[PDB]
Amino acid sequence: NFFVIKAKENGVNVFGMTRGTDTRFHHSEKLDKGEVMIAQFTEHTSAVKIRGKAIIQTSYGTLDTEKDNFFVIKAKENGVNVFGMTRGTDTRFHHSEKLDKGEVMIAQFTEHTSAVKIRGKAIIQTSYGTLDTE
Amino acid sequence: NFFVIKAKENGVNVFGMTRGTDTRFHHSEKLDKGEVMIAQFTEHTSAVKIRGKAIIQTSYGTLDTEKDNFFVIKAKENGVNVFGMTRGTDTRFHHSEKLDKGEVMIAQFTEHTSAVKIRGKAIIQTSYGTLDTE
Amino acid sequence: NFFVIKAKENGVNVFGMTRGTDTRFHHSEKLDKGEVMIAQFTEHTSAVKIRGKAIIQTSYGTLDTEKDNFFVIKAKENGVNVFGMTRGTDTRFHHSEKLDKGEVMIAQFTEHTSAVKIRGKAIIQTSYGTLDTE
Amino acid sequence: NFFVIKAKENGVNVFGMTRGTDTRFHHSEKLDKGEVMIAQFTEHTSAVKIRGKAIIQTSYGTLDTEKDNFFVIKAKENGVNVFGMTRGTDTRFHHSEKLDKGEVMIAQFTEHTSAVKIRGKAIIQTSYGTLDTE
Amino acid sequence: NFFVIKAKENGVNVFGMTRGTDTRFHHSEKLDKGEVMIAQFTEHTSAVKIRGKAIIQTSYGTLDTEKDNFFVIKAKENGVNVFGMTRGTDTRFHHSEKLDKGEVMIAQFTEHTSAVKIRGKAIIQTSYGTLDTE
Amino acid sequence: NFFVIKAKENGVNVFGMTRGTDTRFHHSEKLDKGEVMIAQFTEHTSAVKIRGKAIIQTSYGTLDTEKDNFFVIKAKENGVNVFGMTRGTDTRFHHSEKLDKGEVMIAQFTEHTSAVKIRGKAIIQTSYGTLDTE
Ligand SMILES: N[C@@H](Cc1c[nH]c2ccccc12)C(=O)O
Numbered sequence: 015n016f017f018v019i020k021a022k023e024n025g026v027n028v029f030g031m032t033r034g035t036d037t038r039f040h041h042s043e044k045l046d047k048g049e050v051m052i053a054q055f056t057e058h059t060s061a062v063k064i065r066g067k068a069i070i071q072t073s074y075g076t077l078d079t080e081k082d083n084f085f086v087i088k089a090k091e092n093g094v095n096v097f098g099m100t101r102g103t104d105t106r107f108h109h110s111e112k113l114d115k116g117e118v119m120i121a122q123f124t125e126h127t128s129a130v131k132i133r134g135k136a137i138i139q140t141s142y143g144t145l146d147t148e
Numbered sequence: 149n150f151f152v153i154k155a156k157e158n159g160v161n162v163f164g165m166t167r168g169t170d171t172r173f174h175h176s177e178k179l180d181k182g183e184v185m186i187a188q189f190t191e192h193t194s195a196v197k198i199r200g201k202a203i204i205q206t207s208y209g210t211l212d213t214e215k216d217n218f219f220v221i222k223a224k225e226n227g228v229n230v231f232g233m234t235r236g237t238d239t240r241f242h243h244s245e246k247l248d249k250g251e252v253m254i255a256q257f258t259e260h261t262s263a264v265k266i267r268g269k270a271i272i273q274t275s276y277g278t279l280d281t282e
Numbered sequence: 283n284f285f286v287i288k289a290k291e292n293g294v295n296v297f298g299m300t301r302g303t304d305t306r307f308h309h310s311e312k313l314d315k316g317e318v319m320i321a322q323f324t325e326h327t328s329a330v331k332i333r334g335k336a337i338i339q340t341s342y343g344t345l346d347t348e349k350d351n352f353f354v355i356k357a358k359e360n361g362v363n364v365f366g367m368t369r370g371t372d373t374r375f376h377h378s379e380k381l382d383k384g385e386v387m388i389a390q391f392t393e394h395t396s397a398v399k400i401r402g403k404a405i406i407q408t409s410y411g412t413l414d415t416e
Numbered sequence: 417n418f419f420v421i422k423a424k425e426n427g428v429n430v431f432g433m434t435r436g437t438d439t440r441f442h443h444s445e446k447l448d449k450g451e452v453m454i455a456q457f458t459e460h461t462s463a464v465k466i467r468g469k470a471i472i473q474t475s476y477g478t479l480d481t482e483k484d485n486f487f488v489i490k491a492k493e494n495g496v497n498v499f500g501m502t503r504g505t506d507t508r509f510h511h512s513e514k515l516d517k518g519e520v521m522i523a524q525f526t527e528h529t530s531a532v533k534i535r536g537k538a539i540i541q542t543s544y545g546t547l548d549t550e
Numbered sequence: 551n552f553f554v555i556k557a558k559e560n561g562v563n564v565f566g567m568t569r570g571t572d573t574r575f576h577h578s579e580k581l582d583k584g585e586v587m588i589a590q591f592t593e594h595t596s597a598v599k600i601r602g603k604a605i606i607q608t609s610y611g612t613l614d615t616e617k618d619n620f621f622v623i624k625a626k627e628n629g630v631n632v633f634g635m636t637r638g639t640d641t642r643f644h645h646s647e648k649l650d651k652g653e654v655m656i657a658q659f660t661e662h663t664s665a666v667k668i669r670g671k672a673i674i675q676t677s678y679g680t681l682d683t684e
Numbered sequence: 685n686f687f688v689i690k691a692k693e694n695g696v697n698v699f700g701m702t703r704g705t706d707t708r709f710h711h712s713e714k715l716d717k718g719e720v721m722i723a724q725f726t727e728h729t730s731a732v733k734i735r736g737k738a739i740i741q742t743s744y745g746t747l748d749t750e751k752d753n754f755f756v757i758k759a760k761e762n763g764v765n766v767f768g769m770t771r772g773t774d775t776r777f778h779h780s781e782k783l784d785k786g787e788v789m790i791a792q793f794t795e796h797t798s799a800v801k802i803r804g805k806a807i808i809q810t811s812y813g814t815l816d817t818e
């Protein structure tokens with residue numbers, strides 16, 4: 015699995031996330047207008063966070079952040095939260111990522127994640143189709 | 149395999165079921181209006197139970213509970229029962245789940261289940277197509 | 283592989299068949315009007331026999347018994363026989379199942395079966411298409 | 417891989433062929449009008465010979481003998497021969513099967529066969545399409 | 551992978567090529583008008599050479615020599631050469647096959663071949679599409 | 685995976701790139717007008733560089749350099765750079781390839797590459813679709 019990022023403006027930032035028990039931020043790369051980034055989901059990276067006006071293009075389709083197994087989340091309005099639920103005998107929220115308007119999160123189901131919870135006004139995409147919370 | 153749950157109202161409840169010889173209830177998660185839950189079928193979870201007005205979306209299609217290998221069951225009217233039949237030399241009902249109107253059950257065929265029996269007025273979906281008991 | 287059975291009347295009976303050298307009957311389950319049965323082909327079960335007015339639905343399509351690798355046989359008229367031919371150096375009929383009108387038999391090719399013989403007026407379905415003896 | 421045989425007349429005969437170095441005839445089964453035979457290609461059987469008015473139905477399509485990796489040969493006129501060429505360092509004809517008008521031969525590529533030669537007026541079918549010698 | 555050869559004239563010749571470090575000619579078979587040859591690519595044979603008026607039919611499509619991973623080469627005019635480039639740390643031409651008008655070469659990428667070079671007026675076919683040098 | 689190169693002019697040059705920690709140039713082959721080159725991505729070669737008027741044809745489609753998992757880059761204007769980002773715990777640019785106008789680079793994601801960065805005016809193609817930086 016892999017995705018594409020194109021920047022419609024300067025300052026677009028792409029964050030990496032660590033795979034495993036610990037969910038922390040992997041140092042980021044900056045994209046200027048016209049620059050393109052193509053990346054895969056690897057052993058060390060299982061999720062990413064995209065901030066700024068950008069074109070995100072994946073196997074499911076194309077997304078425009080400026081306009082109003084793995085899955086995609088887009089924030090229609092500040093206050094969106096994504097919870098990761100632990101795989102195994104116990105179910106608990108081991109990570110809570112906050113998404114601001116225009117931010118996009120791409121994540122996979124991992125050894126430590128088998129379920130997630132999304133809150134607030136957001137756009138969600140999946141292999142089967144797209145879903146709107148509002 | 150994975151599914152999607154969206155809540156059209158507050159109080160929507162999603163139950164997990166234990167995989168193995170014992171069929172009991174796995175502690176549940178609550179969803180408010182606009183919240184979304186994406187989950188997989190795992191080693192410890194092989195079936196789920198959904199209660200309340202919700203949009204259930206799977207590989208086979210989309211279901212609306214409010215309106216009138218794995219499979220889906222929806223209850224058109226109280227009194228629906230789902231029996232699990234034991235895999236192996238002997239065939240017996242090792243579990244009997246009751247479904248009320250609007251409740252949806254998503255289950256897989258497991259090491260301990262190779263056949264099920266559905267009773268009453270219900271809507272059933274499968275990879276091959278949809279089926280109505282009435 | 284799995285199939286679906288729905289009953290259009292009371293008294294519908296579904297028989298299981300033992301996989302292996304011995305071909306005998308596995309104790310049956312009864313279905314009333316509106317009841318649905320979903321079952322797989324397993325290590326111990328490799329064929330089934332369906333009797334009564336029912337809707338049989340499989341990967342190949344849907345069958346109605348009331349109207350006039352694995353395969354399906356339906357009897358248009360009493361006197362239909364299905365012979366199982368032994369896999370290996372020798373070819374002999376190790377089992378002879380009789381089908382009455384409206385009865386449906388679903389069977390797979392197994393370690394002990396690599397060829398079958400059908401006699402009389404019957405309807406046959408396969409992955410490639412449907413066939414009528416008459 | 418498997419095929420279907422239906423008889424449009426009495427006396428239809430189906431021959432089996434031995435897989436391995438030796439290519440000889442496996443004792444045959446007889447089909448009367450309306451009888452159907454469904455068989456697979458197995459360790460001991462890798463080719464068959466069909467004689468008489470019959471409907472031969474395979475993954476590639478349906479054939480009518482009466483009218484004017486594996487492959488199919490039909491004889492439009494007596495004198496058709498099928499040669500089997502040895503797999504390995506040497507290429508020689510280790511078997512020569514003669515086909516009369518209306519006879520159909522279904523064969524696979526085996527450990528001992530990697531090429532065949534067809535002579536005379538015949539109809540040939542393959543996964544990619546059909547071919548006529550005349 | 552396998553191909554089909556049909557002869558539109560007498561004297562059609564099919565050559566085999568040895569797989570491995572050494573690229574030499576494998577003794578040939580002759581085809582008369584109406585004769586058909588079906589062959590596979592094997593451990594010992596990885597390429598073939600076809601000479602004369604013939605119908606060559608493959609997974610990609612059908613070719614007519616008389617008219618004006620694996621690949622196909624056809625010569626529109628004498629002087630066509632096909633070079634085989636060595637797989638590994640070094641790149642060198644270990645074989646140079648000459649093709650006359652109407653001759654067709656079918657070859658695979660092997661342990662010793664990972665790249666080829668074609669010169670002159672020729673027609674080339676591949677899984678993705680057809681290509682003309684002129 | 686494999687690609688096709690055809691030359692619309694003399695002097696077209698194709699460069700190979702070494703797979704592994706070290707990213708250096710593999711000695712090149714020259715193509716004259718009408719010549720065709722078909723090559724695979726191998727253990728020792730994971731990327732190529734194409735210079736001159738040529739037709740590049742791949743699984744995704746056909747490209748014309750003269751006109752204005754693996755991916756393709758084309759330069760609309762001098763100054764295009766492609767950075768390779770290291771797979772593993774650390775992210776750094778271990779190689780920076782410069783592309784002039786009309787030059788085309790075809791590269792795969794390898795054990796040492798899991799992400800790339802493209803700068804300037806360029807055309808990018810991927811399995812999912814095409815992308816333009818301008
Ligand atoms: N470390 C987590 C990262 C992760 C995966 N999916 C997520 C969903 C939400 C938040 C974090 C995650 C994991 O590999 O499982």
Ligand SMILES: N[C@@H](Cc1c[nH]c2ccccc12)C(=O)O
Nearest residue numbers: 100101102128164187190192193
């Ligand atoms: N720990 C649970 C998480 C889970 C999976 N599916 C669920 C459905 C509902 C609630 C929790 C879950 C498991 O891996 O099985």
Ligand SMILES: N[C@@H](Cc1c[nH]c2ccccc12)C(=O)O
Nearest residue numbers: 166167168171232255258260261
């Ligand atoms: N513990 C059971 C759960 C189950 C699977 N399918 C079912 C159908 C009905 C009721 C329970 C189940 C199992 O893993 O087999």
Ligand SMILES: N[C@@H](Cc1c[nH]c2ccccc12)C(=O)O
Nearest residue numbers: 234235236262298321324326327
């Ligand atoms: N114990 C049986 C259950 C079963 C499978 N298929 C059936 C069909 C009908 C009745 C029972 C069954 C088995 O695993 O084989």
Ligand SMILES: N[C@@H](Cc1c[nH]c2ccccc12)C(=O)O
Nearest residue numbers: 300301302305366389392394395
């Ligand atoms: N015991 C038999 C059952 C069977 C399979 N296919 C059949 C066809 C006809 C009659 C019986 C069978 C077997 O496993 O091989």
Ligand SMILES: N[C@@H](Cc1c[nH]c2ccccc12)C(=O)O
Nearest residue numbers: 368369370372432455458460461
């Ligand atoms: N015992 C034979 C059965 C068989 C296979 N294909 C056939 C075709 C015709 C008659 C018998 C057969 C075998 O396994 O090879």
Ligand SMILES: N[C@@H](Cc1c[nH]c2ccccc12)C(=O)O
Nearest residue numbers: 434435436439500523526528529
């Ligand atoms: N014994 C031969 C049978 C055979 C296969 N393909 C054939 C084609 C023609 C004649 C015989 C055959 C084999 O297994 O190889």
Ligand SMILES: N[C@@H](Cc1c[nH]c2ccccc12)C(=O)O
Nearest residue numbers: 502503504506566589592594595
């Ligand atoms: N003995 C040869 C047979 C063969 C394969 N492909 C061919 C093409 C032409 C002639 C003979 C052959 C081999 O296995 O390689």
Ligand SMILES: N[C@@H](Cc1c[nH]c2ccccc12)C(=O)O
Nearest residue numbers: 568569570573634657660662663
């Ligand atoms: N002996 C060579 C034969 C070959 C394969 N592809 C070719 C292309 C051109 C010429 C010869 C070949 C090999 O197996 O690799």
Ligand SMILES: N[C@@H](Cc1c[nH]c2ccccc12)C(=O)O
Nearest residue numbers: 636637638664700723726728729
């Ligand atoms: N020896 C080289 C051959 C090669 C592959 N791809 C190429 C592209 C261009 C030139 C040569 C090559 C290799 O196996 O890697």
Ligand SMILES: N[C@@H](Cc1c[nH]c2ccccc12)C(=O)O
Nearest residue numbers: 702703704707768791794796797
């Ligand atoms: N040696 C590098 C070559 C490479 C792959 N992808 C690239 C992208 C850009 C530049 C170089 C590369 C590798 O195998 O990983």
Ligand SMILES: N[C@@H](Cc1c[nH]c2ccccc12)C(=O)O
Nearest residue numbers: 030053056058059770771772798
């Ligand atoms: N070293 C990182 C590279 C990487 C993968 N995906 C990314 C997304 C953004 C930034 C860097 C990355 C890894 O293999 O996981």
